[PDB]
Ligand binder design. Structure first.
Ligand SMILES: COC1=C/C(=N\c2nc3ccccc3nc2NS(=O)(=O)c2ccc(F)cc2)CC(OC)=C1
Length: 822
């Protein structure tokens, strides 16, 4: 059985576990055994949770960031069901009491024994919360729908739980011998090498002497650094770049000077180099796995006597306000001098102090750490800053995780993407961030779900395959059942890929009707009906994808011919009618990021009582240029609606009227006002989000409207100004906001206020976006490469200005956009 599980893990994670063994690598081996044990413990803990606690693990609550309503309720084993009138303010427990009193009378005769499942979803309603605090009840009110719930007894939830079981001494200056190489180029070669702690150089960057492009080159050269060996900080990083000149970059390579056991390295190393875009401190500290093709530098770390980094026990032994809100050498001096007073009275300025400390002076680092040990825990916002690559010190990292542990699961979920990217910055395999993410992922199945996908979607990237592979393994060891659930997802994805490859070939040889029919026959094969049906959605583990409706599946006409897959579920009723789009050929990372930031905006807006009626739909890369999009049904593109076809409801005298005619036909009589309001609010949200994020190439083909009137965006190929984007007001949106009237400053100006509120709220959290994007610089998203991309956010949010000036500035941009409206 152990063999079976091992083989399933290899299939799931996209790397055979034998590849870990073949490395004959102590660190890998220690991570696997340590992490296996940690994960296994978490599962044992889990197998004995109370039933409500188990629910908490498996179906975490979906909550929003008097008035009456109708609800339908039924019990697990029977078809019979009752419709109740309840108040949005009622607890689930009250509703459950009605359900039982109804059962008792019909069936001729304890609420706390039950949870309420949402029909045909992995979603539950429990806790002391009024019904409308639950996302699902709230959603039902806006969409108009009746909530349909099922009474699930504790012995049934427990039956589910059961089925799911498993030193200071050395004053001589640091130096290395550069022996030889083996590589390809056109001219002379030079090796440049610098020592880094994060971004900062610990001293100047020394060079080789020009040697001809010959060989297989040979140097055998001491390179002596302008720094003492005793001063090398724990996280010292030695970086190499090899290039050509008579500037032509060839390759780069980095390593930590101390191994994972705190021991300084000696003697000879062979460094398999990574091909170039000279010095790359933020690049990984593990060699290029393609040893056959990779250029290889061989160096020699000289024996300085085994020597270890001193224990913390040995470390611990060894106008200020006016600036503190980039700083000159003297200003830096006042900060270091007043470090205790910073700890005592400004513990939130920890990062500014950490940047000013001299990381190339062992004494100063001792004192800095000493303060860090007694430092009070910081708010999450501050912790998110300390995870930036500027803070490579693992006591700082340890501190930041410590300050992060107080994240809620919802918060942790909100930032999961960024924390995963920060994994790429880590100097070693076993680290606090890994243990933290794995622990929280095993304590919450939703977190586990997305941690897995964020990792799985990057397995094709050699610089991260080993790390990400090992983490997924560890997870699997901690949840066997969930491993099987994920395989099912991976089997579905694998089928879609073959199906999509067919569609691409077929679409070049035949007419769309014929390709569609052939897609359908292919889908109707047993292997395909089996693989594509009865899974959890990778977009949302609480969405069940039951029976694929082949007849409604199809594909779109865009280059990659993405697949449109429809699903249905008897047990979920209408709500189990859901769509996913499969796309293979495009990078979805950028779209995922943009959608997460828009969803964050919506969370922040709603926290100040502003609901802009946003559509935060799923988008999830799953593999190499592969991922999924959640279909928002009952929507169409502006372009399609503006085709202004005859013989339809929406037929207008003037094209400017098409959009509003369409809304009218989907919203008869009195419902039109609300649709127009829905459209106005969402328009404001998306105009602000696109403006702040620098999303250009917005046009009628990538903007969609729902039948409710809500407006949303698809296909973000470009953000942060990369193809300074103006604020955008389109005439046809303006026409709709103005209820079809030429002049309507009452409606238009309400709209302006929506934008202004939405924008001013985001500025108050500007720092949160800045820290989040800072962390994403680790993703290697092509439009999120350097500082000038972050600057785009500094400028769009005008964080330098007071709220008076920023609102003045925003007002001009807005007015400028209105003038551009014809
Ligand atoms: C999110 O909900 C929907 C998405 C839909 N399509 C697409 N969503 C995307 C979201 C993010 C990134 C790319 C998306 N592409 C969608 N469709 S598409 O690939 O055919 C397309 C690509 C480029 C375009 F300008 C327009 C559509 C369609 C739809 O109903 C028709 C609902």
């Amino acid at each position: 059985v152990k063999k079976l599980i091992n083989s399933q893990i290899s299939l799931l994670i996209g790397k055979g576990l034998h590849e870990f063994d073949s490395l004959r690598d102590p660190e890998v081996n220690d991570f696997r055994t340590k992490m296996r044990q940690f994960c296994e413990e978490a599962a044992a803990h889990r197998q004995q949770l109370g039933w409500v606690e188990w629910l908490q693990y498996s179906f975490p609550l979906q909550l929003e960031p008097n008035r009456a309503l109708l609800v339908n309720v039924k019990f697990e084993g029977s078809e019979e069901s009752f419709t109740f009138q309840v108040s949005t303010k009622d607890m689930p427990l009250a509703l459950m009491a009605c359900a039982l009193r109804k059962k008792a009378t019909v069936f001729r005769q304890q609420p706390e024994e039950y949870a309420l499942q949402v029909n045909g979803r992995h979603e539950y309603l429990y806790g002391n919360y009024p019904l409308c605090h639950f996302q699902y009840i709230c959603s039902c009110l806006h969409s108009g729908l009746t909530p349909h719930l099922t009474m699930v007894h504790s012995s049934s939830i427990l039956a589910m739980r059961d089925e799911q079981s498993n030193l200071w001494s050395l004053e001589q200056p640091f130096s290395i011998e550069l022996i030889e190489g083996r590589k390809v180029n056109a001219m002379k070669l030079v090796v440049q090498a610098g020592l880094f702690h994060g971004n900062e150089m610990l001293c100047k960057t020394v060079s080789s002497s020009e040697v001809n492009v010959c060989s297989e080159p040979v140097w055998k050269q001491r390179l002596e650094f302008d720094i003492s060996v005793c001063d090398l900080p724990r996280m010292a990083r030695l970086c190499f770049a090899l290039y050509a000149v008579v500037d032509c970059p060839i390759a780069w390579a980095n390593l930590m000077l101390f191994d994972y056991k705190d021991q300084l390295k000696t003697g000879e190393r062979c460094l398999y180099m990574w091909p170039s875009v000279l010095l790359n401190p933020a690049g990984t500290v593990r060699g290029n796995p393609n040893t056959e093709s990779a250029a290889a530098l061989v160096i020699y770390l000289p024996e300085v006597a085994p020597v270890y980094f001193p224990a913390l026990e040995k470390i611990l032994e060894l106008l200020r306000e006016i600036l503190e809100r980039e700083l000159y050498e003297h200003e830096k001096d006042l900060v270091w001098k007043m470090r205790h007073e910073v700890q005592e009275h400004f513990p939130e300025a920890l990062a500014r102090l950490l940047l000013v400390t001299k990381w190339n002076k062992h004494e100063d680092v001792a004192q800095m750490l000493y303060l860090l040990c007694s430092w009070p825990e910081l708010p999450v916002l501050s912790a998110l800053e300390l995870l930036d690559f500027s803070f490579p010190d693992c006591y700082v990292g340890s501190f930041a995780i410590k300050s992060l542990r107080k994240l809620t699961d919802d918060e942790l979920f909100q930032y999961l993407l960024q924390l995963v990217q920060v994994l790429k910055y880590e100097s070693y395999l076993d680290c606090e961030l890994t243990k933290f993410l794995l622990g929280r992922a095993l304590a919450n199945r939703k977190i586990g779900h997305f941690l897995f996908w964020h990792l799985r979607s990057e397995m094709h990237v050699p610089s991260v395959a080993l790390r990400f592979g090992l983490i997924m393994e560890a997870y699997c060891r901690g949840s066997t059942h969930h491993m099987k659930v994920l395989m099912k997802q991976g089997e579905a994805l694998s089928k879609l890929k073959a199906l999509n490859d067919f569609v691409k070939v077929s679409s070049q040889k035949t007419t769309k009707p014929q390709t569609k029919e052939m897609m359908h026959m292919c889908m109707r094969q047993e292997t395909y009906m089996e693989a594509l049906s009865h899974l959890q959605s990778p977009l949302d583990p609480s969405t069940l994808l039951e029976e694929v409706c082949v007849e409604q599946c199809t594909f779109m006409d865009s280059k990659m011919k993405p697949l449109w897959i429809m699903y249905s579920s008897e047990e979920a009723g209408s709500a189990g009618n859901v769509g996913i789009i499969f796309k293979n050929g495009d990078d979805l990372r950028q779209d995922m990021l943009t959608l997460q930031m828009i969803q964050l905006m919506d969370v922040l807006w709603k926290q100040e009582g502003l609901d802009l009626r946003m559509t935060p739909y799923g988008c999830l890369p799953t593999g190499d240029r592969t991922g999924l999009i959640e279909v928002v049904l009952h929507s169409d593109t502006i372009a399609n609606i503006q085709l202004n076809k005859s013989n339809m409801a929406a037929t207008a005298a003037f094209n400017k009227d098409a959009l509003l005619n369409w809304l009218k036909s989907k919203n008869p009589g009195e419902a039109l006002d609300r649709a127009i309001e829905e459209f106005t609010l969402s328009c404001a949200g998306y105009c602000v989000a696109t403006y702040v994020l620098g999303i250009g190439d917005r046009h009628s083909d990538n903007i969609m409207i729902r039948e409710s009137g809500q407006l949303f965006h698809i296909d973000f190929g470009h953000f942060l100004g990369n193809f300074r984007v103006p604020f955008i007001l389109t005439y046809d949106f303006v026409h709709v906001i103005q209820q079809g009237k030429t002049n309507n400053s009452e409606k238009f100006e309400r709209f302006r206020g929506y934008c202004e509120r939405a924008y001013t709220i985001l500025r108050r959290h500007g720092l949160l976006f800045l820290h989040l994007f800072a962390l994403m610089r680790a993703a290697g998203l092509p439009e999120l490469s350097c500082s000038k991309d972050i600057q785009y956010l500094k400028d769009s949010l005008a964080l330098g200005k007071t709220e008076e000036e920023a609102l003045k500035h925003f007002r001009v941009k807005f007015n400028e956009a209105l003038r551009e409206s014809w």
